Amino acid sequence: MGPGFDFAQAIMKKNTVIARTEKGEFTMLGVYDRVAVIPTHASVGEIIYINDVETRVLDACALRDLTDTNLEITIVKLDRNQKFRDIRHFLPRCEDDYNDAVLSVHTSKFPNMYIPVGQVTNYGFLNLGGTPTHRILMYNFPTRAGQCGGVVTTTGKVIGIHVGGNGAQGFAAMLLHSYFTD
Numbered sequence: 249m250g251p252g253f254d255f256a257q258a259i260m261k262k263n264t265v266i267a268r269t270e271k272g273e274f275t276m277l278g279v280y281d282r283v284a285v286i287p288t289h290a291s292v293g294e295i296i297y298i299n300d301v302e303t304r305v306l307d308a309c310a311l312r313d314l315t316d317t318n319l320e321i322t323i324v325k326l327d328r329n330q331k332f333r334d335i336r337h338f339l340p341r342c343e344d345d346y347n348d349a350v351l352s353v354h355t356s357k358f359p360n361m362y363i364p365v366g367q368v369t370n371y372g373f374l375n376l377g378g379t380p381t382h383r384i385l386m387y388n389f390p391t392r393a394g395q396c397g398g399v400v401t402t403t404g405k406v407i408g409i410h411v412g413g414n415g416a417q418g419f420a421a422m423l424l425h426s427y428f429t430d
Contacts, residue, residue, distance in 0.1 A: 253362055256350040256401045262333045264354050264399065268297035273355045275397035276324075277409060278332030279339075279428050282306070287396050287411045287421065288322045289377070296324070303327055311427065317382040320411045320421040323428070338406045339425040345370045346402050349387060351410055351418065353398040361398075365389040365418065368400065368407065374419055376412050383422040384411075391418035 259277075267276035269290045276298070278284045286292060292308045304327035311319040346368040353361040365387035374384040385400065391413040398410035400420045408420030 251403050252348055252350045252364065252401070255403050256352040256362055256399070259335065259338075259399055259401055259406060260352050260354055260360075263335050265298045266300070266355055267397070268300070269293065273357065275353050275355060275395075275399065275410075277397070277399050277406070277423075280334040280336055281331050281430075282326045282328050283428065284324050284326060284332070285409055285423065286322050286324060287409060288318065288320050289396070289411070290322065292322055292324055296326070298326060298328065313382050315382070318376070318379050319383055320376060320379075320381050321409065321423070321427065335406060336425060336428050338404065339423050339428065340405055340407055341425045343370055343383060343422060343424075344407075346385075346405070346407055348402060349407065350401050351387070351389070351391070351395065351398045351420075352401065353395050353410075355394060357394045361395075363389060363391075365400070368420075371419070374412075376419065381411075381421075383424075385420040385422060387418050387420075388416065389418050390415055
């Protein structure tokens with residue numbers, strides 16, 4: 249409908265796949281080459297379905313900060329025959345707050361879904377499903393089951409992936425440029 253939704257759509261149409269694990273269907277953001285991200289609670293194994301194609305996982309790393317705290321991001325390398333468009337230049341370098349974000353989801357349940365979530369707080373620490381978690385972004389929207397892996401964007405920046413909510417607020421794990429240096 250406007251410039252926020254334009255940038256979000258641009259990301260969804262070239263840099264997402266539908267990922268299926270034994271824990272369900274997730275929006276999965278491809279970042280560069282065969283490298284993608286997914287919430288750690290998806291429990292990625294040796295084999296994952298990508299757009300309903302059986303795919304070997306070449307590597308999977310559940311990220312933690314240098315305090316050995318959960319970040320709720322898993323970086324996955326897929327045995328896929330095609331590279332993602334490199335979007336690393338859209339990733340922030342530092343922890344920050346943001347105005348006017350969009351949460352974008354694409355699954356079987358929720359195809360072509362875009363949510364204007366408003367202001368995004370650098371929230372920091374969250375007890376996420378009983379797990380202490382760092383680098384959390386918060387927005388005041390009542391997000392629902394099915395939205396995990398959803399991409400959080402501003403105009404020009406890919407800032408996070410949706411990892412949970414409490415019925416009033418939603419919570420995203422930060423994406424930082426430094427996660428995807430090679």
